Amino acid sequence: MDTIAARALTVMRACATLQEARIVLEANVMEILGIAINRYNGLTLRGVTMRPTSLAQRNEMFFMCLDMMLSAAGINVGPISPDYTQHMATIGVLATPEIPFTTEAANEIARVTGETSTWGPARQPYGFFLETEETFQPGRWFMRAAQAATAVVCGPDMIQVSLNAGARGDVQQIFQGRNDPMMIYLVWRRIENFAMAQGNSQQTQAGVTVSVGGVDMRAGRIIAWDGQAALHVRNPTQQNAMVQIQVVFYISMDKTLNQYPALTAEIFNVYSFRDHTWHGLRTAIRNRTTLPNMLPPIFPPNDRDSILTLLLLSTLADVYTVLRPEFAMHGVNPMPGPLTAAIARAAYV
Amino acid sequence: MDTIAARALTVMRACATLQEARIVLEANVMEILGIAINRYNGLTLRGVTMRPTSLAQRNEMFFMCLDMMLSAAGINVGPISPDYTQHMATIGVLATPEIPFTTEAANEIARVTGETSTWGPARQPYGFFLETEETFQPGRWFMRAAQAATAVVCGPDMIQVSLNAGARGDVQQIFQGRNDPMMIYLVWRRIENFAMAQGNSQQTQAGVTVSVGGVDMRAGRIIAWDGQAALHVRNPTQQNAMVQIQVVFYISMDKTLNQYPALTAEIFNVYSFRDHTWHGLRTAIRNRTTLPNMLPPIFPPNDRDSILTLLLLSTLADVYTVLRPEFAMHGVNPMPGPLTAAIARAAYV
Amino acid sequence: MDTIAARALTVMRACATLQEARIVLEANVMEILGIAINRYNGLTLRGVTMRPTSLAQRNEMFFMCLDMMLSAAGINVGPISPDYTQHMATIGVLATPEIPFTTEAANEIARVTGETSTWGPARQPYGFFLETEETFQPGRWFMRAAQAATAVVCGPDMIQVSLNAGARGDVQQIFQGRNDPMMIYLVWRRIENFAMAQGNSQQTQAGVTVSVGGVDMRAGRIIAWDGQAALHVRNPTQQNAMVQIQVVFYISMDKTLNQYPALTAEIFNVYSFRDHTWHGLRTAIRNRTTLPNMLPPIFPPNDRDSILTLLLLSTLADVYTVLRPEFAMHGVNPMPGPLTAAIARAAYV
Amino acid sequence: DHRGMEVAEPEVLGVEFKNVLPVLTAEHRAMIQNALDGSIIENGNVATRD
């Protein structure tokens, strides 16, 4: 199956080489398309040419890639065009060890299947305390009833602890219960000039300390906190003190956009407009998938199929560009105008 | 035209494979390299060797890549060296359909020209309210005269709304007029403890409701706001209230650094020092462009020529590395002593 | 006539096997279709192909199935299409012994004809007392003037009997007169806490007894009542007592949806939308029948013709699905391509 | 030609099995026969072809 995808990929990538009519191709390309087109036209019964020129020929070729792309992705688009009709037979041609696949294509799939199947540590995208309902003003004192030390959120990646003179206590429990971090990188600072319950300016005397799991840590330095250790703050000072602890960044086993090389750029390419025909095509294709038909997912996918599909589509996108195909699509009405940022904007629902 | 670029590109990446060849593996490449070098040497009258060894031979080959790279970028650097002279004829060498190009080069270009010619949705880099002249203290109450609900910017990606007990109102207009977003992603929270006009602490009671386009939304959750729907906040509570709304990230059709795969890394590679000769060269080249001659552009380019040029330079950079060219350059004075971060820092004006 | 229908069915089913073009057919199929199609084209004068590809070919074939479907059901649709025309002669084709029919089809019809022509016991669909005009509050005491025992309905499948201390009496008559059951399945309980004429909570003491035809029955157990035996309740207790007797379910000789295997799923299939073409067709067809033209009959049919028609049509539906016919009917304005639940909803007048 | 399909003659395949045939169980024989008239000419009924 990986092999199938690698092939479909290799073929499309090679079709992308046809920028002109007469130009000579690299032998590698000829070999690939030669065998491919043969077995393809064989079981397809369609008339694809190594060297398309007309348009009708270019369409035919694009359809081929499209056929393979869909077949490699395992998609059944259905009646979406009066001009194009998907051939299930395409899959039979890809499963055929006859058609080769580049080493790059091999490793590309090997990586996708590789990471997609397991997990790993990754710098998360947003602030730690992003999914919080209540936030407190930063720098403002706040002591909960009966407590000598009161830690509280003040931002998406910010917390501040209010300590009474001579007070001390554990803070960790403010972080816990959220997500499933493996390592949280901290950096604490002294809130040198903060607001009091009434509005008067108050100073935090130099001498307050923060120790993790027992060891004392410096302020303004990064700290590798395992999220489990004893996050302890002490106020040996004879005055009220407030300190802010910052989650510069943390790491979890959730899939980020850096799971596979330049995944971002690809997604951009797929989601890009080009023209109505492309747009609706790309849309109509993803309508069969778990992916947002025309707007970048908020959250990066984590399954083989998704990543793969995007890659194939992204490539198929470039193929579309070089081929300049032209055909009908149910529900799509093309505006002949030169196309502007504006016209594109409108297209997205 | 793109074909010309692909060719030139192919050539360079190929020249960057003679660190020591001893029977090349990629037969594809060779066929092309030979062809190209012959065509070049014919119209150039220079003597480029398949296997450079001396230095003069290495310089020769480099100069070639340079010539092609420049011709491909549509750049005429003029007299920048006593050793190198640019041959415009180079364009006539890349125009020949006799010269093939790798599938790699083909796709590389197809991507560039592809996206560079159209638009697409992309996560913007900086905070929404970054281009603001005025900002307010976070958590601090503020009610503009005669208004019962006063929304205001408190950060680059932060706003806070001051509501009087029993008050309500639309907030959307604070966002509008700025940029041209397609989708803004929000997350609102209740500012549990905030400063009053006088400085006294105040509580925001639970029950405040934020509804988009009519539907009521939860706090601490991400929200897909189209920028046109009704952003309404209600304060059914018998006390003042302050809620903070956050633009976690937005998307627009403005080109970002992810318009093309690992564009970032390439740019770094171009703007990197290496040595004085390279430095001044890379500069002298960009002086003919719209791109900053020695400091990474603040804003990611959006035109073909820009992106392309960078790529060619990035590649020509590597070619420079492997070849170890040695030559003069008007206005450049080489300091042969080993090289340190210090010596480099100095070179950047 | 059984034979005729069986054949018409067999044929349609066979055409449904033509999912693709170059696929190998099950020997059995070719054999049938051949004899059929030729004989049809013989008496029809139409040009049906055993392996359609064009569209007009597919239409012709569909028209054939349609021609037969109607004939087998004895339906004359009339001038409903400028493209299709019904050939009454089709019936003669279904009457030719030379065209065989599957064992499946034979048994299928034999089942329909079998049950349709006779009656049988079946778990009825709705509550026993569904067709009641007056209903009483459940658990609320109620004694009709001059009576010591007063039974009354408190739901679609619920009756409660109000008993005075020391009272007793037969209840059966409340059930009689309605429908024509063969066996009513009861289960009685004591209303431990009920409302009195004034509103005060009253208890029902343990010791009350219900007896059918003389034999005493336990509470909370299912009782097979013949509807004719004496339903006697006794209140030997020294307090008022209320008992609820429940008709869990009953069986009569009426036709339910379980008269013929998965009749339900079939009906759903017939009434399903697909597209304006199918819809309008399926509609216009049933306009010749006693069946609702576009909404599942409240009550399950009971005559051969209805059941038959449904089945045939259901199958012709599937044929339509594989053949993808394209043509128009007077009064039908089709919207091609992307159909949505919304567009479908709207289609049902 | 065989049952509406055009199949390849055992000669164009890649095997010497004639040796085996005589020792085959009615069952095995049959199986193989199907495999033989199994391999068809894909496009088969099309004419034109090439």
Swiss-Prot record, chains A, B, C:
Keywords: Capsid protein, Glycoprotein, Outer capsid protein, Virion. It is found in: Virion. Coiled coil: none annotated. It comes from the Viruses. Glycans are attached at residue 287. Its main location: virion. GO terms for molecular function: host cell surface receptor binding; structural molecule activity. One of its GO terms (cellular component) is viral envelope. InterPro entries: Capsid_hemagglutn, Orbi_VP7_capsid, Orbi_VP7_capsid_C, Orbi_VP7_capsid_N, Virus_capsid_a-hlx_vir. GO terms for biological process: fusion of virus membrane with host plasma membrane. Pfam families: Orbi_VP7 (PF00897). Homotrimer that assemble in a complex of 260 capsomers on an inner scaffold composed of VP3. The VP7 protein is one of the five proteins (with VP1, VP3, VP4, and VP6) which form the inner capsid of the virus. Belongs to the orbivirus VP7 family. This is Core protein VP7. It comes from Bluetongue virus 1 (isolate South Africa) (BTV 1). The gene is Segment-7.
From Swiss-Prot, chain D:
It is found in: Virion. It comes from the Viruses. The VP3 protein is one of the five proteins (with VP1, VP4, VP6 and VP7) which form the inner capsid of the virus. Belongs to the orbivirus VP3 family. This is Core protein VP3. It comes from Bluetongue virus 1 (isolate South Africa). The chain holds residues 152 to 201 of 901 of the full protein.
